[PDB]
């Protein structure tokens, strides 16, 4: 029995969570404090929770949110000299996931693309913080991205 489109998405999310787990271990090892910021987050109106569950509004939110996360994953790869390959694997893994999800939504279309030139300003603002605030930013991106993916996986199984 070959993987269905749903099973492939489900596996790809668990695969990226295993990667975030591995990239957290390298960025925490490297941090000298380990071992404002508006990151995508599910709310009840997005239709991804059991209360107010709405399959179509939910799938649009998952895709919109992953697209909004890409500049943060570029921030991680641009920073992690040592964890270079691992951070790039997470970016490219997230790109394949977005492609699987866009095939599922091919019936819906539209979707809010983030503005490129706002994302290039965000990037510069993030890279000009002192090392403390950049280590905090890294932690908050990895935590928030993990929580988005777990919420996405729960919603996708309820479809």
UniProtKB/Swiss-Prot annotation:
Produced by skeletal muscle. One of its GO terms (molecular function) is cytokine activity. It is found in: Secreted. N- and O-glycosylated. Its main location: secreted. Changing residue 132 to R: No loss of activity. Disulfide bonds join 28-34, 48-58. Keywords: Acute phase, Cytokine, Disulfide bond, Glycoprotein, Growth factor, Phosphoprotein, Secreted, Signal. Changing residue 157 to K/E/Q/T/A/P: Loss of activity. Induction: Plasma levels are highly increased upon exercise, due to enhanced production by contracting skeletal muscles. Up-regulated by coagulation factor Xa (F10) in PAR-1 (F2R)-dependent manner in cardiac fibroblasts. It comes from the Eukaryota. GO terms for biological process: acute-phase response; cell surface receptor signaling pathway via JAK-STAT; cell surface receptor signaling pathway via STAT; cellular response to hydrogen peroxide; cellular response to lipopolysaccharide; cellular response to virus; cytokine-mediated signaling pathway; defense response to Gram-negative bacterium. One of its GO terms (cellular component) is extracellular region. Glycans are attached at residue 29. Component of a hexamer of two molecules each of IL6, IL6R and IL6ST; first binds to IL6R to associate with the signaling subunit IL6ST. Interacts with IL6R (via the N-terminal ectodomain); this interaction may be affected by IL6R-binding with SORL1, hence decreasing IL6 cis signaling. Interacts with SORL1 (via the N-terminal ectodomain); this interaction leads to IL6 internalization and lysosomal degradation. May form a trimeric complex with the soluble SORL1 ectodomain and soluble IL6R receptor; this interaction might stabilize circulating IL6, hence promoting IL6 trans signaling. Cytokine with a wide variety of biological functions in immunity, tissue regeneration, and metabolism. Binds to IL6R, then the complex associates to the signaling subunit IL6ST/gp130 to trigger the intracellular IL6-signaling pathway. The interaction with the membrane-bound IL6R and IL6ST stimulates 'classic signaling', whereas the binding of IL6 and soluble IL6R to IL6ST stimulates 'trans-signaling'. Alternatively, 'cluster signaling' occurs when membrane-bound IL6:IL6R complexes on transmitter cells activate IL6ST receptors on neighboring receiver cells. Belongs to the IL-6 superfamily. It is linked to Rheumatoid arthritis systemic juvenile: An inflammatory articular disorder with systemic onset beginning before the age of 16. It represents a subgroup of juvenile arthritis associated with severe extraarticular features and occasionally fatal complications. During active phases of the disorder, patients display a typical daily spiking fever, an evanescent macular rash, lymphadenopathy, hepatosplenomegaly, serositis, myalgia and arthritis. This is Interleukin-6. It comes from Homo sapiens (Human). The chain holds residues 45 to 212 of 212 of the full protein.
